[PDB]
Amino acid sequence: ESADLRALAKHLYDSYIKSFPLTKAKARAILTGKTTDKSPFVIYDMNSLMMGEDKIQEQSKEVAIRIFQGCQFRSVEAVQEITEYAKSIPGFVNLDLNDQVTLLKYGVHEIIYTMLASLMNKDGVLISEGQGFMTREFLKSLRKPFGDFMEPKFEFAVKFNALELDDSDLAIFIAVIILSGDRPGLLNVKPIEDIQDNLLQALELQLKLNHPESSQLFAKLLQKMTDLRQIVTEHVQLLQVIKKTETDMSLHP
Amino acid sequence: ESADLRALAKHLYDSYIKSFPLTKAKARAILTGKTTDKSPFVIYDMNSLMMGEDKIKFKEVAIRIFQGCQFRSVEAVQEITEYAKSIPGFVNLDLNDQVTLLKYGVHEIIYTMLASLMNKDGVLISEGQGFMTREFLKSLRKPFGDFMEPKFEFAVKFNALELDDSDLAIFIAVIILSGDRPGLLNVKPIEDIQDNLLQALELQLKLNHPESSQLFAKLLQKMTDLRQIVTEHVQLLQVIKKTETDMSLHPLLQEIYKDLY
Amino acid sequence: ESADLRALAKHLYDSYIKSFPLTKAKARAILTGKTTDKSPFVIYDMNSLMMGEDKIQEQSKEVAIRIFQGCQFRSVEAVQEITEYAKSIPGFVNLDLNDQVTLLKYGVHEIIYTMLASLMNKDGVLISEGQGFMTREFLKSLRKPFGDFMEPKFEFAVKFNALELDDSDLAIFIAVIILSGDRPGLLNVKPIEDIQDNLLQALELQLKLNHPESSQLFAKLLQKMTDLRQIVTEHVQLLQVIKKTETDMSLHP
Amino acid sequence: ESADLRALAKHLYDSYIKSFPLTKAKARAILTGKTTDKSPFVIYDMNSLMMGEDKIKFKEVAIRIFQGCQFRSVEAVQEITEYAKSIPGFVNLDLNDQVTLLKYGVHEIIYTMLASLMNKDGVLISEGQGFMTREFLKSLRKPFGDFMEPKFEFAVKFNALELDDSDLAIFIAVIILSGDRPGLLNVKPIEDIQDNLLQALELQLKLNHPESSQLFAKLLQKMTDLRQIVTEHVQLLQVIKKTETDMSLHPLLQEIYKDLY
């Protein structure tokens, strides 16, 4: 019934709030400006990065490489918030432990880029739990292999954010992504699709009720999931370029 | 022979009274107020449920009631196992078959004896200290609502048979000694014991209920109502696995449900 | 009167015969040898145990632990024969149901060791309804905690068997043990002692008539009841050692 | 609070099962034959060692066994690092402190979990495919003989505590989050996490082992047995440097031992 789908949406929203402290609502307030009690420091070039560097990884390498490696560090931090959120998705913890691992392994990147768009506008991205803001232009200016890393993320985010989803929408969308029955090496696919069908029903009703004037938003959101998959494949592609072409190494395992 | 069969009937009734504190006789006294010691607190909605739980002085509700169910089921399994040990010939069987008979028989017996605690309006809970209404249980959010109603439907029809504890003692033994359980290694010795129990049950019913036409057959037909209840229950368990978060049962209940039909 | 005490002794003897198929008389014939139509297989070591193992619980554990657990299994089988015998003791079934349970709970172990002595000689014990014979030496050779388990049973049995009691004596002695008014948590002690007094009278006359040359056998037999209680307490003691000190578990409830 | 502490205990047990294929439960099944799939090949002398190594069909021995030790240690470090990442709050720490916690904690955890694979007679080797006897290990030429015996002495006493995998999951996290490691930059945030883990461990032990008096304290006392094992081991490493020819470890193991206590 409709009530049960709404209860599931609410349960997911409350868990999401518990697992992810920097929510889209909080982040949008910062990107604009409501009661500026603590306006974030803006990193717009090499010198402003230094300015903030010894304001709050530390210095002793190519800035380009410290920024790229900082991306790695934060992304592993994020995996842990996502893993905990996943446990709250009804039916996830009762899946084969091995399939849980696989679901997380191949879903975490798509989720990071989804939630990263909450922290972005067309001109830059919130960093350090929202205390900083790094410009898209500065990131774009970094050394050749590295100057192209965030751009596809920004491009996705501008198009994704024009959908105007809120946290209650995103909570369900994220759960839908995790419960993807098409991940490599899953053992028991049917149970996963069974849960995803329930989550898709809940997502569909959520968007129809929250965005009644946005025609076919549900289909449009599903379409963004090929966008996300492509972004990940490029990012993974890009990580090969690096792995082979650098004197630099010291990655988060 | 007749005196053997009555001695067997009496032995079972004896062990039953020894193994199961809340008998049918005792439940009926309570349900009917023939007792004048402690009338049960009735739970019919969320407000009375809160009061009922907090009456301890002198997660969610649907998963919370499921959890009590689990605890009580474990307690029931312990009682039924003690009863089973007393059935002549049971402990002499292959140990793996004893396990197999308990694994498949325990839930059939749980629903049989639950009927003793039910009327068409509700079920006795907390060693008969509370009464939870059928309508309240029916109300519970989707899947959890579907757990108890089939039991009520069975119980009202089963209770119309008017069996008493002495009848039930032999019927429960019949259920345990079922030679058709999956994975049984030595079927005939079980069937031979069941034959003797069936003989004793038939005699017990003809003597205790002489005016009840074909009661023996009618009771054996309930064994198909029972087997249906259990497969429905196991199905519902798979629904709870998909729609609920952290569940995981007691080690005893997990073993019983492990690779069950 | 004397006749009534003899009638009670006979009633108990007939019930005993009905409840316990392997009687002392049958077992003594086997431990010696009268018309050897089916001489029992002797288990005198690890390899002879295997020999018989796949001759007739099954193999997949420390032999020591399978033997000890076999002891548990058989002892629960024996409780059921004892429970049925108890019903035939005049007045037992009319006692409070709860007291019946308690009498059996705390009496069953003493009875098992009493009747076990019928199946023993100084060198070993009949097993598998008399089809096998396990040596005392082999049992003694088992792993440290377990090699000490049966010895006290053998020690008791050698001294007990020197009393030369027969089944008709034992039937009454067993009934005397069950009707012990000193068991913990009995509700109505007087009715139990009333019945035990009757059984003691019958036992005393039985021994005076059956063993007239055995001076004070009655007193001597009563004295064995502290021996039995001590054996049980040690065995229970020993079960604590195990319960705490083993990777092994899977006991008869 | 209580439900938080049980949720933490459950999360750790979950990650532990995910990060460590050969658990205690699985080692005990093997050591005890409760499994009926593949009984381990026992190595007790040089002749059985040869046969054991050449059973791959379906330098010197003392340095050769040391080398397997090294390979397995590296594999263990990878598993423990994956486990550590899952401990709530760990990846949020200063990266240099994360490294420092792994560097000093890894060997304490290796010997803790090795105990799971040991009885008083020997140790499971090759993902539980082999069993190498304590006496054989004790036999090894001077210095190499001295490596394994202290581990056995610890394991038998540790194993008497009867911890299970769910207990061990939280104890290993306690070990990792030790605020007293040399060179830690931010001690308090580590100590705060360890406080919470200690709370969860205490509750887990009281619930899982209610009859085990002062088990929590007894377990924490093992942390001093463990720290002693590691300093002894590092000492022994310096002996191997003087009495052996070309050794040199894996890059991962060299980093861990680099300027270690």
Ligand SMILES: CCCc1c(OCCCn2ccc3cc(OCC(=O)O)ccc32)ccc2cc(C(=O)c3ccccc3)ccc12
């Ligand atoms: C055999 C369970 C009997 C039963 C009960 O029977 C309703 C019929 C539905 N039903 C029968 C068996 C059974 C098993 C079940 O799951 C068992 C399992 O998962 O192991 C779910 C529902 C169920 C309703 C409420 C109870 C409520 C309680 C409680 O003590 C209780 C505990 C906490 C809070 C409120 C109430 C115990 C038993 C109940």
Ligand SMILES: CCCc1c(OCCCn2ccc3cc(OCC(=O)O)ccc32)ccc2cc(C(=O)c3ccccc3)ccc12
């Ligand atoms: C954590 C090591 C566990 C372990 C083992 O434990 C015995 C306790 C002694 N011990 C514990 C840790 C440790 C580390 C050590 O050096 C480690 C290092 O230098 O990095 C030497 C001995 C040692 C014995 C034999 C093994 C043998 C093997 C092998 O797979 C093997 C490989 C090649 C040939 C034979 C066997 C793996 C692990 C063993």
